[model samples]
Target chain A: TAELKICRVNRNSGSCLGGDEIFLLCDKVQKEDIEVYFTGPGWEARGSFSQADVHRQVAIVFRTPPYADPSLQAPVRVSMQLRRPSDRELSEPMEFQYLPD
Target chain B: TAELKICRVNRNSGSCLGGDEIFLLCDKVQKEDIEVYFTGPGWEARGSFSQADVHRQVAIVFRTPPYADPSLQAPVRVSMQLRRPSDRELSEPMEFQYLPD
Candidate 1:
């Protein structure tokens, strides 16, 4: 599989209701074919952003998607990873925390 | 001259006493030959970080250097840029603020 890697993200946690902005740094990527995936307990969603949000093939500015359930009373833990649609390649996952809204 | 660019930094301001860590996203770069320079008036300082802090050629984790005048009573503005030592290439400057401590 072609390599896809995420170097770092400015933050790892945000409101459970989501809509938190994130600045992520990563290995070179194709702006038009990448996605940021979030998954937890059979639920899944993708970060929100346009190709214009990808910077220099090394960074992405995006907003977190709302968790599958937003009225949670406790913090929820999930994982995020980079996905290359062209080849279905995925980077190693990073932990993300969704705090109570 | 080779291209060296900084896309974004997690922060743009910190205590005038410095030592604030910043997560900067950038274009491809040679980790071994890059520098983060801060300049204001006739004063100058370099961010502190080892090459190990450069992540995957796309981001750098560094601490801001103390302002020339650490006893500042008001915010001091400065410009920061990326310097490529090999050819002395430079990236456009970004504004940084040093808040009074």
Candidate 2:
């Protein structure tokens, strides 16, 4: 297994508008045969490569899922993880605050 | 016509080893209805985004075509232009040097 550290995410603002696209620049990785989860306290979102595109491990372009109601939730900071049924790799939890506008 | 200037190409080295994937960050533009050409000596190649993928007009992820036989050719820096069959918009020519490895 290779080290999976996210050097940085591409975007000017750390807080991103939900349903917008963002890029994750990490050590070459993929989630095609696995599941990716963005876990937060109130919600847990999963992603599929069929819906989004993952480059040859180095880059990925994905859209954020809908945010929980802003009235009930102050912007949520979520961490991501990748899981495979047989084998898997977990990324060091990174903070990505979701801004619901 | 909106300004179609290329702000940057993602790969760090200005020259790319042929057959590698490169991302282009430009003033939002698309080649879906147009043809993108990479012109150089001995070979003038036309591209159809189907072989590659373009995201809206803002970004494009493409593969560099094979070099024109490095043994007989030097590294070539070519310019890009997009032409639609009907009325078309042109991109300010951008240089992408293809290095044969």
Candidate 3:
């Protein structure tokens, strides 16, 4: 009904040190009930998919420690919650901010 | 009244092939009459900025294979054209590259 829409987010990929990955594209969504979450300081949770219904994307691999303390950063906010098919909880909470270290 | 600035570039939408989009925040010099252009085959055109007087930055997208041939990589030298907004060309050859994919 209304859930996924994180068009893009990339960390440049020099082989990923501070780690980063994100890409979501879903409209009439239904990726087997999608769910992705992350808070701050050394964030985790790195996988999610569903490429049909137009296209879906989610890949999060985060880590930070090299000279850490630009405020300590990796992924400070990432949220995706979709569960339709009658489960309700469509959407509201898609964030981005991983710039500190 | 100059051109826009090229800001960020995100290329991580697995469902797609290649090519990324860039962000442009301007003001410094109206995109500083920006200039940057690059070719193909392990491309290169990676730096430029003027962030304060207004804000301006550019970065072109490009690519090559992978597997690390490292055959030939480095700046092949890129440039743009624009004389002036008062005595010549306003500016228009902002290009960028740096990829062998």
Q: Highest lDDT, which number? A: 1
TM-score (chain B) for candidate 2 is 0.65
* Candidate 1, pairs of clashing residues: none
Off by over 4 Å in 1: B56-58, B69-73, B85-89
TM-score, each model? Answer: 0.81, 0.43, 0.27
Global lDDT of each model? Answer: 0.87, 0.54, 0.33
TM-score: which is higher, 1 or 2?
1
Candidate 3: count of backbone clashes, pairs at least 3 residues apart or interchain = 15
In model 3, the Cα lDDT at residue A9 comes to 32
- Candidate 1 lDDT, tens digit per residue, A18-74? 899898888888999999999889998999999988877878889999998889899
Error of 1 at A5 (Å): 2.5
Question: Candidate 2 chain B — worst ten consecutive residues by lDDT sum?
Answer: B8-17
RMSD list, candidates in order: 2.9, 14.1, 14.3
CAPRI classification of candidate 1: acceptable
Off by over 4 Å in 2: A12-17, A48-52, A70-73, B1-101
Error of 1 at A65 (Å): 1.7
In model 1, what lDDT does residue B40 have? 88
Q: How much is B34 displaced in model 3, in angstroms?
A: 16
Q: How well docked is model 1, in DockQ terms?
A: 0.38
Which should have the higher lDDT, number 1 or number 2?
A: 1
TM-score of chain B of each: 0.94, 0.65, 0.24
